[PDB]
Structure formats: structure tokens, C-alpha cells
Amino acid sequence: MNTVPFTSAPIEVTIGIDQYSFNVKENQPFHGIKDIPIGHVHVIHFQHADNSSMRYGYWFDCRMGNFYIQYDPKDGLYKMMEERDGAKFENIVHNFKERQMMVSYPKIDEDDTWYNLTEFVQMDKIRKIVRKDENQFSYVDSSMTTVQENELSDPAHSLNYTVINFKSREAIRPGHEMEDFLDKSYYLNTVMLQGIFKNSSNYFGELQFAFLNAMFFGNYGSSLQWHAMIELICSSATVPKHMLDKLDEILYYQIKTLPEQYSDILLNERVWNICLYSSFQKNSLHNTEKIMENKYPELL
Amino acid sequence: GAMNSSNYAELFNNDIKLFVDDTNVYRVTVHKTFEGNVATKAINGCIFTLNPKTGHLFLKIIHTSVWAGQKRLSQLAKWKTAEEVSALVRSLPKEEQPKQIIVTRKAMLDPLEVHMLDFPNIAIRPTELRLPFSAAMSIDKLSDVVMKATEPQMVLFNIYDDWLDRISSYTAFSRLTLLLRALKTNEESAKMILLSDPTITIKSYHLWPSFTDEQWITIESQMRDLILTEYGRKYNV
């Protein structure tokens, strides 16, 4: 069980840790989050009480270093930092724990939600989508644009998701125009899986990361990438059976976790109607079709 | 974006552009089988590809052999159209290639865009205009070359005959759309109007009769009367 201490909380803020959230008052004696499960990535995220715009946060893995949060009054945000002195860090955490100044990661024993949402998500892949090589953790916010959104403006602040474009020479073999447009199996299996991602685990990791950035930060380009990666599988007639079964599990937990009140902005009607009712895979996503029909029958 | 009544003069500027009409690509007769089921029999079709400034018509004849053993023919017909338009563009010298292709039916946009990926600077546009190019097969010489074809063939025409010697491309296009709208609304009546006077003939090298400027005014009036009559019937107004 690892710990992310906070130096202090000088401004009133709603703090998220994965799917959980806590309100902290201005100058409340709050000194961090303990009992964080080892084995998963995590995200610690912020929404200020005085400006509920710019949700922002940090992806990290406590196996990769000792991380803490400290408010910067110049840049006006909570920043993640790495403590390189192990003994200073252990001494800070032990003191804050003894004074019970830390919230406990509130995981129910039965509850695999976080594992199910991050099964394929690896910190090393996050650090290639979010490029800031001097840190072992990754900053994301509501406003960051994707490489694809930028092509259609600060490159160093971009989300480098894999570009997917159904009307591109990458997607369409000369001489197989109708075939490749109506059946995206060559684009999925040869270009994306064999070519770029190398395996289905890396593809699913990026799909899961995109979803979580959409949900936690309202990051619109992330939502676009999540839907594009769903549509590319559902629009392929030839998909390995293990990938279809895994996608149904992935999407079921994403739809299960989504706040009911955000379905209007986070779910694309066209993609979901096409994927569940028209696509090659309309009959391959039983779990996802059942939770979507019971939770969001209006969208469909 | 979309070509409409607002941006109509753009058709006659000096930017090369083509209209593509796929209406007559996949043509069938529907009939009963011996067992009393229904079946289709394909007949030869054509792509109607028109430069509205010059009148140059690229009539690609679609021979029934291209459908043999294929499924979902109304879908395939759009892709085959886009394949043949792409092949036509690639066959033209660079200085003759269009800067825009206007499709008469929105269902042609994705097929044509995908086949033209190699030409990112050629704009593929829809139109809000309701153009009567489906009636091309009411022009006897066009219908005759399509029906006689025994293999895929491209035939080149000038759909304006020699009109551009006397009138602008705006006026020529308006005359063509009026003739085709009349032929579409009441083919028998339109053809009667065009051949009623036996002294006015069609030149071997032309599609339409050799009307004088005054005869064209009389003809155009007769076509407008035909269209309004028919309209009052369609809607009881």
C-alpha cells in the first residue's frame, strides 16, 4: 500500500483519486492519500471550488517513485513532484499517518472496478501519449488537444493518441477502396494491431486511457479517440474472438462507471447505435448491449 | 460546401469542374419468374459526367457484365461510379483535371472521396440543386450508344452542340436543364415539341435540333408550358 502525501491544501478543491472524490476546504489540515493499491496505474485529479473549469490531474504508478502533491501559488495549481530522498519521504509519510491527516483509498474488497477500467493501461504507454520525459508521472487536463485535433496548436502539450482516420490512405489500400471502407479488418488487423500497436493489449490500453481522460477531465479529444477505437473494431468483419470478448468486458465496465448525468456529452449516439445495432459486431457485445439498453435507452 | 441557387454562377467560372450523376449506372427491369417470384434483369447503364462550362460530356457506358456474380448491386454501383470517375481524372492531363467534382446524389460523396484520396486538392461537393440529369437517357443518341454497347466503353459528346457559338455557358446550362426537366416530366410531349416541325433536323454530329435563335425561344416557351401543366396535375393546383 503506497502513499501520496500533500504538503498542504491552501485552496478549496475537490480531489479525485481514481473513481473516488473528496472535498477539501481552504487551509484544511489535509496531508494526502494512503493505502493506494500497488499493481495499477492511478490518477489524482483536481477541480478548484472557485474555478470549476480546468479539471486537471496526474497519472502515476507508486512502483516508479515516491510522489507528492504541493500547491504552487504562482501557477495556481496542485503539482505532482517526485521526492528522490527515500528517508525524508518515509519520515514525512510516517508523521502524517501518525497524526491521521490522510484519507484512505476507499476500496471495497469485492470491488474490481479500478482493475477492470485499467487492465491494459501501463505507465510506460501513458508516458508516450503524454510526452514530459523528465517526470515519471503524466499531467492531463480538460483543455489539452490531441495530435489529430491539432492537424485539422502547442505540440509539447498534446495528447499523442494513435491517429485513426477512416478516409485516409493509411486506412484504404489502392484497389480495395469499397472493400476496406465497408470492412475495416485490414486497417484494424494489419495496419493498427500488427503494425503500430504490436498486440491487442496495447490497443486496449490506449482505448482505456482515452476513456478515463474523457470521463475524469471532460477531455473532448480523448472522447473522440475512445469512440474511434471502438468503431474501428465494430466496423471490422474479422476480429479475433478473444478481442471481441475482451472488448465487451472493457466497455461494460466503462458504461457501468460513467456518471448517469454525463451520458449526453460523453456518449456519441451515431457510434453506439452503429456499433450495437448495424456493425459486423452488433451481436458480439452482449454485456455492453444489455447495460447500455438498461442505463441509456434514450441515446439508442 | 454544397452547390445551391446562392453560388450558381460558380458553375461558369474558369475553375474546371465536373457534375457526376450516377442515377443511370444500375438499371433494371423488374419481372415475374416462372414460379411467380420477382426477379430483376440488368440493362446497360451509364455515368453522366458533365463539364457545365464547356458542355463536354464523358459518358461512361456501364455494361451489364460488370454486375455478373456481384451482390448488393445498388451499393456497388456507387463505388463503380467513383472508381470510373477516379480513372477518368487520372486519364486527363494535369491541366485538364477538375478542381471540383459536384455529385448530384449525396450517397456518392463517401465513395468518390475514398477513390480520390490521391487528389486531396480536388474538392468533392454535394448540391442542393435538383438537377434532371436522370433524363439523359431520353436523349435518343445517348440512349442508342448505351443500349448498343457490347462491352465497357467511354463516349465523348458536347451536350450543348454548337450553342456556345451564340450563347453563354450560363444560358446553355439553363436551356439544357429546361430540356431535361421537360423530358423527365413528360417525355412523349417533350419529344413531340422537339421534332414537331420536320424541316428542323438534328445534325449527324449533334444531339438536339438545329433551331434558330427565334425557334429556341418558341421551343423553350413550349417546354416551360409543358412543365407547369404537368405540375398542376401532379398537385391538383
Curated annotation (Swiss-Prot), chain A:
InterPro entries: AAR2, AAR2_C, AAR2_C_sf, Aar2_N, AAR2_N_sf. Keywords: Cytoplasm, mRNA processing, mRNA splicing, Nucleus, Phosphoprotein. The modification Phosphothreonine is found at residue 257. The keyword Phosphoprotein applies. The modification Phosphoserine is found at residue 236. Gene3D superfamilies: 2.60.34.20, Aar2, C-terminal domain-like. Phosphorylated on serine and tyrosine residues. Changing residue 236 to A: No effect on interaction with PRP8. It is found in: Cytoplasm; Nucleus. GO terms for biological process: spliceosomal snRNP assembly; spliceosomal tri-snRNP complex assembly. It holds the Pfam family AAR2_1st. Residues 244-265 are annotated as: Leucine-zipper. Signal peptide: none annotated. Its main location: cytoplasm. GO terms for cellular component: cytoplasm; U5 snRNP. Belongs to the AAR2 family. Heterodimer. Interacts with PRP8 (via RNase H homology domain and MPN domain), competing with BRR2 for the same binding site. Component of a U5 snRNP complex that contains at least the U5 snRNA, PRP8, SNU114, AAR2, SMB1, SMD1, SMD2, SMD3, SME1, SMX2 and SMX3, but is not a component of the U4/U6-U5 tri-snRNP complex. Component of the U5 snRNP complex that is required for spliceosome assembly and for pre-mRNA splicing. Involved in splicing pre-mRNA of the A1 cistron and other genes that are important for cell growth. This is A1 cistron-splicing factor AAR2. It comes from Saccharomyces cerevisiae (strain ATCC 204508 / S288c). The lineage of its organism: Eukaryota, Fungi, Dikarya, Ascomycota, Saccharomycotina. The gene is AAR2.
UniProtKB/Swiss-Prot annotation, chain B:
Signal peptide: none annotated. Residues 7-237 are annotated as: RNase H homology domain. Changing residue 21 to N: Reduced growth at 30 degrees Celsius. Strongly reduced growth at 16 degrees Celsius. Changing residue 22 to A: Reduced growth at 30 degrees Celsius. Strongly reduced growth at 16 degrees Celsius. Strongly reduced growth at 35 degrees Celsius. Changing residue 23 to A: Reduced growth at 30 degrees Celsius. Strongly reduced growth at 16 degrees Celsius. It comes from the Eukaryota. It is found in: Nucleus. Present with 468 molecules/cell in log phase SD medium. The MPN (JAB/Mov34) domain has structural similarity with deubiquitinating enzymes, but lacks the residues that would bind the catalytic metal ion. Component of the U4/U6-U5 tri-snRNP complex composed of the U4, U6 and U5 snRNAs and at least PRP3, PRP4, PRP6, PRP8, PRP18, PRP31, PRP38, SNU13, SNU23, SNU66, SNU114, SPP381, SMB1, SMD1, SMD2, SMD3, SMX2, SMX3, LSM2, LSM3, LSM4, LSM5, LSM6, LSM7, LSM8, BRR2 and DIB1. Functions as a scaffold that mediates the ordered assembly of spliceosomal proteins and snRNAs. Required for association of BRR2 with the spliceosomal U5 snRNP, and the subsequent assembly of the U4/U6-U5 tri-snRNP complex. Functions as a scaffold that positions spliceosomal U2, U5 and U6 snRNAs at splice sites on pre-mRNA substrates, so that splicing can occur. Interacts with both the 5' and the 3' splice site, as well as the branch region. Has a role in branch site-3' splice site selection. Associates with the branch site-3' splice 3'-exon region. Also has a role in cell cycle. This is Pre-mRNA-splicing factor 8. It comes from Saccharomyces cerevisiae (strain ATCC 204508 / S288c) (Baker's yeast). The chain holds residues 1836 to 2069 of 2413 of the full protein.
